[PDB]
Ligand binder design. Structure first.
Ligand SMILES: [Cl-]
Ligand SMILES: [Cl-]
Lengths: 216, 216
């Protein structure tokens, strides 16, 4: 069924997750306990209470995963790409791409987490405040475990960042696009890489309406 | 440089390979020796002398990998998908897709191994005469090793067969399309999946001219 379950750890001490994540929660508890103490030492983005909040998303209704390597170095919320005040460069560049693709001119913000069929994801679920990929060693196996579970549900995996994702062993056993980082210099590639996965969808599944992410 | 090197085994006893495959040849010798005796027991497709002939292809000039799970159950040549007399269903269906995409009406045959930028590949390099995926257990680690090496060179990995490739742990560390099997029942998906990877190319690399495969 569709429900939220619960599991015990140490800081945030309790992880609430949607039913769909069950197959993975036993190993995630094992992995997090042997790692948390090394991890919690630093000021993190997001705060420990927000590490796993994205596990409250169902995967049954997801067909696309938009994956960044890790949360914003500062002001991370626990929801990947989310910037509640729309000041973070990465989500502003995605918004502009979508704006250009769809034809939507006016908007106050953009959020990938409110689009039907889309789960936004952070490969590593944290980093030390102000330092990208700084907690990579701690999430290692957890990261592989959770992306393995996601790619069983979603049809398209869209990774943002070529060098960010350059050395990452991961899943075995679907359609992957390794596009540029949203804040890359030189546009056509960014914008076409988001239009290209609705036609990868067409081969079987329903399209994504990327404009559902716009906040007015 | 660009040259063909040589390595020692036991049946076919000698493996000739292009320079580009060097990083992988030490492990492939280790892996093949501990496996060959179990493998050579059966009548195979292709014959042992043809197992590794596709290692004579450079990878430096390859941007697309078209991957089947293993050679034809009968009449395999050592070159993936190749049917010298154009009677095998899989290559005839690919040819028809290309014919429909390109506009080429008349041809005697089709070969993926004569297209610039394309390396055709068999995940498992053999099978028992008349039985698909029958030598899967023997190639296991070798298969992972060689596809790992290919995907470092190519920009697009195109796998043909959803259930054929359903349970396959593989590479870590690029753009993957898991399309249908060429001999699938119900066409648009087959043909669009081959037109879709030239635009995945466009994001960075030169296009593939699929019509280069036609034999007149
Ligand atoms: Cl984030
Ligand atoms: Cl073959």
């Amino acid at each position: 069924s569709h429900m939220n379950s619960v599991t015990v750890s140490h800081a945030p001490y309790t992880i609430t997750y949607h039913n769909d994540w069950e197959p993975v929660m036993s190993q995630l508890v094992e992995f997090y306990n042997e790692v948390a103490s090394w991890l919690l030492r630093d000021e993190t983005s997001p705060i420990p209470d927000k590490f796993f909040i994205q596990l409250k998303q169902p995967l049954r209704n997801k067909r696309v995963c938009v994956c960044g390597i890790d949360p914003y170095p500062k002001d991370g919320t626990g929801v990947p790409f989310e910037s509640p005040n729309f000041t973070k460069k990465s989500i502003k560049e995605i918004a502009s791409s979508i704006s250009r693709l769809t034809g939507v001119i006016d908007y106050k913000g953009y959020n990938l987490n409110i689009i039907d069929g889309v789960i936004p994801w952070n490969y590593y679920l944290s980093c030390k405040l102000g330092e990208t990929k700084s907690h990579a060693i701690y999430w290692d196996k957890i990261s592989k475990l959770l992306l393995q579970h996601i790619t069983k549900h979603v049809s398209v995996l869209y990774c943002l960042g070529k060098t960010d994702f350059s050395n990452i062993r991961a899943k075995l056993e679907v359609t992957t696009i390794v596009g540029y980082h949203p804040a890359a210099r030189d546009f056509e590639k960014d914008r076409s890489f988001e239009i290209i996965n609705v036609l990868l969808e067409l081969d079987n599944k329903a399209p994504i309406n990327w404009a559902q992410g716009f906040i007015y």
